[PDB]
Amino acid sequence: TCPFYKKIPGTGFTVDAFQYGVVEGCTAYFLTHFHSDHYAGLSKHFTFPVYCSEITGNLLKNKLHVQEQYIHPLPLDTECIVNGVKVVLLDANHCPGAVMILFYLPNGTVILHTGDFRADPSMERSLLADQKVHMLYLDTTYCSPEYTFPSQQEVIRFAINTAFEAVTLNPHALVVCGTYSIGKEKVFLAIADVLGSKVGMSQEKYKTLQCLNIPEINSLITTDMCSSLVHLLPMMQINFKGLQSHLKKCGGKYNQILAFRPTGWTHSNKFTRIADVIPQTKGNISIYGIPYSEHSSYLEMKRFVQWLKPQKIIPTVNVGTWKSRSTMEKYFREWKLEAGY
Ligand code: NI
User: Fold this and answer.
1) Which cysteines are joined by disulfide bonds?
2) Cα–Cα distances in angstroms (integers) from residue 72 to residues 64, 69, 165, in the given order
């Protein structure tokens, strides 16, 4: 049945709650972003109102074939009324189209649901600064102090310089980047840009990216693999077997693969700096795991909450075990005592 942390009190609303069948008394289903754990259950047979960003609405229509009449896209940073309740969608700094949702309850309570987010100081200057938030439904994916990672900028710098060096030394090297969902497009787009190539991909992935309002996308991506030296593949195929195979398919155009796997976190972060990352190599194939995250680090998350000063925090991730729930609650208390709220 629908968990409490997907229900918005004082409303008929749910957030990211599409796999429970008809939720009793739900009048509007909100979707924060187009990732499968959140959209699971939508299809062309869904006949309730779905509220979301424009980009998420493009992906619902084109990829899942949801009918137009049930998709209600809203502009960002704009006060809107939904079943008589004022709402605002804010940029979540997650994947394309991902939003946070501010609800202004008729009784005066103000609720922020972060969806999935990567907290950033820029958020401290959006419409959030203008009023107090009483309840926060928080993306706690990496809510433990061992989760540190570099900025997105530093990670792309590493990937560009690595790819550019390799291909300049060997003009017959192929670059491959793994993907399994939208997000992290900057990885493959920045590499193609430095190399003066388009990124080649399957028809299904080219379709997905054409839904995202990315400026000058017809200029950066293509379904012609032959004319491209940056290839995108499913994340599952980013291993020595899968890559030796792909190389066979390129018909002696290439003699070396350099591959990137943008993971969220991996324990090499606790020790290793970004400067100090090395690949796994077999034969003429090298694989780099880079820590490109679209979720908050522990320190980024802590700053955001100590800035916002909510009266109540409701975690949405890692809620399935008592030890996790209990540990998160202890961090929330420290933050509150250190900051004085
Ligand atoms: Ni997500």
Assistant:
1) none
2) 15, 8, 46
- Ligand 1 centroid to Cα of residue 117, in Å, is 8
Which residues make Cβ contacts (< 8 Å) with residue 235, sequence separation at least 6?
178, 179, 180, 261
Q: How far is the CA of 98 from the centre of ligand 1 (A)?
A: 8
Ligand 1 mean position to 34 CA, how many Å?
7
- What is the spatial distance between Cα 319 and Cα 10, in angstroms, rounded to a whole number? 23
Contact 155, 197 (CB under 8 A): no
Query: What's the gap in Å between 184 CA and the centre of ligand 1?
Result: 11
Å from CA of 325 to ligand 1 middle: 20
User: What is the whole-number distance in angstroms between the Cα of residue 202 and the centre of ligand 1?
Assistant: 22
Q: Cα(242) to centroid of ligand 1, in Å?
A: 26
**178: three-class secondary structure by DSSP:** strand
Q: Delimit the CATH 3.40.50.12650 region(s) of the chain.
A: 148-295
Cα Dmax for the chain: 68
Among candidate residues 30, 113, 95, the one with its CA nearest the CA of residue 295: 95
